[PDB]
Amino acid sequence: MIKAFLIERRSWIAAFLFQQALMLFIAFVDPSISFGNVLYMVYLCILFFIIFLWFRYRKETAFYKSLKTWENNLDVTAINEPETPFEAMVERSIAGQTEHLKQTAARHRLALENEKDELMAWIHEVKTPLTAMHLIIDRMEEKALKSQLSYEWLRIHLLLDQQLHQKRISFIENDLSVEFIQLQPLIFKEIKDLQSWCIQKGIGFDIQLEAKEVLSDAKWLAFIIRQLLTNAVKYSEASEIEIKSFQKGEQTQLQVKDCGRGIDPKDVPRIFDKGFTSTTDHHDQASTGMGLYLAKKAAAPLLIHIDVESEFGAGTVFTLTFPIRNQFEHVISV
Amino acid sequence: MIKAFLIERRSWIAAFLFQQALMLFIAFVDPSISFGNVLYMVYLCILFFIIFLWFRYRKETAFYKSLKTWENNLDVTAINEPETPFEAMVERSIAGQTEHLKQTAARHRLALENEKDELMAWIHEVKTPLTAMHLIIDRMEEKALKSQLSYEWLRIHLLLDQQLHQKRISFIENDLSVEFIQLQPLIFKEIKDLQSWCIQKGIGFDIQLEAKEVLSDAKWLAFIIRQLLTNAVKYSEASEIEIKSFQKGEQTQLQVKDCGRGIDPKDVPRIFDKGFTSTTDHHDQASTGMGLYLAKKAAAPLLIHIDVESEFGAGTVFTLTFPIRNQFEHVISV
Amino acid sequence: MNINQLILRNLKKNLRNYYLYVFALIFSVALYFAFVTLQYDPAINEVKASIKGAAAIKTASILLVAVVAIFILYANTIFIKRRSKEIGLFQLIGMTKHKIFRILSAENVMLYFGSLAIGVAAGFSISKLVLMILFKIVDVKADAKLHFSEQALVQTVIVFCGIYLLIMIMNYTFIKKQSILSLKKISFFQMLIGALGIVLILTGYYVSSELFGGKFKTINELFVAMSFILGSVIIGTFLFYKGSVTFISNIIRKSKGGYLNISEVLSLSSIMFRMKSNALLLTIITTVSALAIGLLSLAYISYYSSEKTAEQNVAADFSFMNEKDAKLFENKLRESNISFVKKATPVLQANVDIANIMDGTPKEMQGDPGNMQLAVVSDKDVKGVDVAAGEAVFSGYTDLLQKIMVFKDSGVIKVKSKHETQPLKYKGLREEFLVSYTFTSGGMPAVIVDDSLFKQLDKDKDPRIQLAQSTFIGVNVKHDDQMEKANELFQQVNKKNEHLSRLDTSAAQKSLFGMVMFIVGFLGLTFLITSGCILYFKQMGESEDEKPSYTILRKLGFTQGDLIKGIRIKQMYNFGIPLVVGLFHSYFAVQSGWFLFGSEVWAPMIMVMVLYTALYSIFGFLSVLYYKKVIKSSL
Amino acid sequence: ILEANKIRKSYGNKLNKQEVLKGIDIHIEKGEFVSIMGASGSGKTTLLNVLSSIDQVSHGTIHINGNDMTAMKEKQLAEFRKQHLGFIFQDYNLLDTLTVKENILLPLSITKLSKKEANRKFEEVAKELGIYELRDKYPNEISGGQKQRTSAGRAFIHDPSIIFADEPTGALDSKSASDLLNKLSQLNQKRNATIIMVTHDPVAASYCGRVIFIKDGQMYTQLNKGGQDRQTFFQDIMKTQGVL
Amino acid sequence: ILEANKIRKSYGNKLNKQEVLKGIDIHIEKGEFVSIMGASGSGKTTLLNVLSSIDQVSHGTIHINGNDMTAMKEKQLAEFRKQHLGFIFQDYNLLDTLTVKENILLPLSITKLSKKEANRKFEEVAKELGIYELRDKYPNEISGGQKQRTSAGRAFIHDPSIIFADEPTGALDSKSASDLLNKLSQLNQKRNATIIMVTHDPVAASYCGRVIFIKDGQMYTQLNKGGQDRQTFFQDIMKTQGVL
């Protein structure tokens, strides 16, 4: 940094050294002034000037070293407090730029929130005509067309429910609630939601509830079971699903055994990945595939472990490993 | 700002003056050095120091002044080219910040169109089963149930097309074109689309067309036709809507007239506002109200003047003043 | 951790905080080197005067080392005391005392010896300038040379090594005895003691303003008066610091009610309470500064008037006692191409009485009022006045006499002849001398009598008190020209140094008083610097004791600008009081006895006081900066 | 008199952010004795700090006496803080080199109100808190109860808009606390001056009119008292606290 | 741990002799927070001197961890106190030239142990107390509360048994004092270590589990708490001090 200081003040260090040389020249030809008696003046002046530069360098090249050290990585307040006017001007420039950047970020966030709110308004505004649709529909007498319109209405309902689950999982973190739930009403509601579609696919239900109580949240687990059941049913055709739930030790375990095509053992660990589509059957393209990803990401707050034992050509055994009730003592109490 | 420069170098002028004082004292004490010559040299050196000081100030106080002009000015490139090593540091710091801000803005906007594209993909995915819903609806027999289902289909279908248009108006600027259009077949097809509406509500139509050709984009004025038709249809009941399209002057005017309730004169200027909804009747609350705002937004680039002449208790007359044909020569030439 | 880095960080912290200590060390070493070099310089033998020459430089050196030693010892006993917490902590952690001594004494032998090495190397550069400054004052024409004088190197190393040994001995005792591991309404007494200080200060001033007056007129009744004045003023100062500051400040405070600004709460909350704690320090500072200013002013006053007193002691440019010497000097001048205006005037010496004309007291006798010796001259010799019979006119001014001998208007003057006495009257007092001081005794003026009475006085010729030479042969010179050849002719005329010249009695006085003024000025500068540093080193502790007060005051909304604005006035009051009292002491010391020295005051004294104040205000200016640094970090 | 609109504040160390405000909005009219309480780990103290000007707000709007300070320069912000907004701290904050009169006349010295007016105003204030008998007493001679009344008398001397008390009755017995709150409430009654107070002693909060139960940055309703007996509201706040 | 029996401090300066200590018995056990508080002029600092071996003990039989302190020379007593006791001062003693980490680690840098376990101990203590983010700073850019917390942590790092402590709250405001007392009480539960505070304000001693009152010597009148709520107990402490 010595080079920078000796190059910045290039003219002031010569505006002085010109005068000693001028004196030592005027005191070489004029006979009234001596030489060995002006070398003394020169020597004393040089000593003072050298000491003055040494004491000036340290005080002057400090703010810029701080600026260089801060740069743009971190410690935005690392710059030293200004003392001289020019440093004050630089400091005002820096503060103005940072403030403007903060304003832009805040405005971007507000615009995004407004867009999300408008999307909320629209999705409610299109949910309500679906309720009107259901109430108008539930009046005919036919069977085949009734069932047809019924399950296409149901698939519209499930895709809309999926988008609603996405919007609510955007902020799920602030809606935790732990209490006892009854699995039988939830399973009955899920079956009722699939009554027409299960009848169309001709798949029965065999419910065996050895366990009684579970300790989790209602809606997210309900939708997880919903999508698992849909996947299991669309993996099967005219087959009976063995739904056995037993209290293995201190934890609740729900096993959904099916006799359908199942999942290939290579793809058994890869069912929860992003955007998985089955190319074996063209009817599997209707599946979004994001439901499994959101289910697995929403299972972490619920602490529910999903165990899958599927064989291709045999069926899929979807097993839910509910966490131990004692493990919730550190969560409910705290 | 001369005061600022002087307070900058208040430590070098003191050094120069101390040098002068010492050089005079040590000359006065000596008996070999003559006092008069040294006094004259000091007189002629203090005069040159003033000129040097003036030149240095004039050269020196420009870079900081320029950036101080920039600290709130609209332009950003007003800063001068740094020369000394104590200005390269400031230039480099400011360059780093002004690159980082632009990077942040680019990333935010990129995320924005990413989420918007995902929304559009989901929206089309929602669209397809509704085409399935139409095929099923067209495959019905009973008159009353089919009429009600077609009514509701039209409601949800116009809502979804409204959403389509209001998200396409976000990038309307990238989808501009000019084409020639036939109006009568499109009008007849749209009327046949709303057959269930008029069957249920008994709304008549009077057709009086004198102009047939217009000069604008197909899809955009086509959706303008749908939005105006739906507005008149939802704002009229059991009335013969007299559509009058005549070449009034050099501009085509789609003067639609209905015998319905009309719009209150106080709310006539506010129809084009964002989110405006009619409060006279409760049936208008179901309407989003975005249609008029988006129609106004998309009509200004196309130079279509929406002249509204609405009378409460009689009907609303919308005068769609098409742009002059000769005004499009500049657009076509460029 | 490792000891060494701890020592090094401590040394950097010390070097930053105490920079006035290092500056004072460098300055003192430089001055000692310069004086010892100048003592041995052979050109010091050109200074010709009554004083021995290079025997005054030795006295200056001896006096200088005492001030430097006292400053150093006191500074280090201030410094050690601010490390009691660290000593206690190191003793509590477990490490012994002979391990703390080697930490806190191995970072002073770096600072002290580095500054000593800088001082010798920067005292070689300034010696020629010091010598030339000396030669300019005493008016000698010689050559100054640059040489090292390796005696002064030895004589500085030995002295400062001795002082450092003393510092180490003084630190060991404090460390040893501090092993304990130990981590407001005014009374009646402080009212009487407060009034007695003001009463005892002014008694000295009043007794001083008389001195050489109508009383104390005895050789042995003077030392009592001087002792009384000095003792009174010193005791009055000491009791003025311990109680009269509290009294006045208490009155000022309890005459405002409770409505106080921030300037007054910052000032009067510390001037009342901590100024009294330092009363054996400000006393010394004030009295010694008074000595410095007063002595320098008197020495300077006795320097301008050298030319006037030389022109008065000898009336003519040369004064002669023998006819043959005068005639041979004139013969030498004859081929000197210089025309000399010779004049002669006989002098008759007698005794008179003017005890009536004295307006003072009979105690102002200075000899017998009726038998005091005077010199009588004729009227024809005087070319400026023409008196008549029965009238006497006094000649000359002699400013000393006007302040001791008081003269009234015309009265009766009796001439004590052998068998007669002609009465005369005093007409007026002249201002131009006519006779060299040898004839006219000490300072007695010369009378003017009519020539008619002179024809009887020269006939009488009372042969009782007549001088050896009743003649004033005195040779003049032509207009202002080259007089040095005439002077050297004069010194080669006389070999028994019994002839007086105007140019040589105006050089001895100049040389002597120039030497005294040189020495006194340098000692005054040294004392000024050391006192400023000591007074700076106590405001440090005073500031660090009010750190909590600043914090509390800053939660009530007061911003740093107001705090610093109050601190400015507080520092003004803290640093101005000793200076003002010292200036008053010096002014009343100079005005008492200036007429004994010269005939010019208020030209030198003003500039001396201005120089002192201007160089003293720097240390007051440099303390507001430390107060700012303390204020900022007490959020 | 006070208007706040969705004021944000997040406590972070530039790497981990710990949000503590979660959508607050408070409206205050002139001359109400409001009290804020609830929990221990919540942000009620941060709330009291952010309503004043001591803590800068992340995102929001503050309107005091119609004037706005969210976008306000630092120098003029300190100025506005100085000419309004009396404070009462937890600790005494008295100077021990000044008497009582000097202590509670010191801040008024900048405005330069001569002598007669300032002395009259001090008499008027200090006759009403019962400290006029201690005009010339140093702080270290009087009991700990009286020093808090001295601090309050200092805070009520220039007639500000809002008094931001921060738990005054924290280190007092029953008698001193009861006297201090009786005098404070009477002073509030006589002169129109709103007082905002954060307290943990329910008997202390009993004297108030409106109570805001801040619970983890949420309103959780707010009691309103009304024209009822002190003990009835005291038992009501007992049962409300027992609910928590 | 301390079973004091007839604790007397010798006096007899010049002619006047004051019986500040006339035989005091203290019975404590591990896992306590007993604190003694008296009045000005009772020589509480002299109680520290007699119990902490700051000065020479005169009378009284006290055993520390089952070991009597009256049966060794000065050096043995010094090593015992340096390896078995800990102290906290009213005015924090931090060297300005060092760092926070070096300040807390300095007492362990003389016995020459392995660096790894020392760093582990510092990490644990700093994480527990809450100054770990202030690991590479100097004591001249942190507030008084953080300095006093550092001084408190300095006495918890050399594995002591009894933490003697003067009033660690004289030079602190309300919030910092409350935080320090909270942290000390929290740390007392994690590891067994007896603290015997000697304070003057009842607020600090209201956090304790036993209080001992002395007015000129043998007076006892000790309180017990037991099952109070720290508020009723605080009022009881201060009223009993007032009546005495």
Ligand SMILES: CCCCCCCC/C=C\CCCCCCCC(=O)O[C@H](COC(=O)CCCCCCCCCCCCCCC)COP(=O)(O)OCCN
């Ligand atoms: C007879 C011969 C006469 C010769 C007299 C010449 C002696 C003067 C010379 C040198 C002084 C030696 C002691 C001062 C050097 C130590 C100062 C130092 O190094 O501290 C540094 C800063 O220095 C200072 O703070 C002091 C700045 C002024 C330098 C000293 C000024 C010398 C003269 C002032 C004394 C005035 C008295 C004169 C009265 C007649 C480090 O501080 P920092 O805060 O960490 O800032 C770092 C920058 N980022």
Ligand SMILES: CCCCCCCC/C=C\CCCCCCCC(=O)O[C@H](COC(=O)CCCCCCCCCCCCCCC)COP(=O)(O)OCCN
């Ligand atoms: C207690 C007061 C402290 C003040 C300390 C200031 C410096 C102390 C030094 C020397 C005292 C000088 C005596 C005061 C003024 C003397 C007046 C006088 O001598 O008259 C004339 C003045 O000329 C001089 O003697 C020069 C006096 C300059 C004194 C030196 C002042 C600066 C001393 C600092 C040098 C040492 C520090 C080195 C740091 C760079 C001489 O006769 P002339 O009328 O010019 O005719 C000659 C032929 N035409």
Ligand SMILES: CCCCCCCC/C=C\CCCCCCCC(=O)O
């Ligand atoms: C008695 C003479 C005193 C002057 C000594 C001259 C020798 C050079 C001394 C060092 C000058 C250092 C001053 C630099 C600090 C800042 C300068 C300023 O602010 O004016």
Ligand SMILES: CCCCCCCCCCCCCCCC(=O)O
């Ligand atoms: C005869 C000339 C006297 C000159 C007096 C002024 C000397 C320079 C003063 C500036 C040096 C100290 C100022 C900065 C110190 C600091 O901020 O630490």
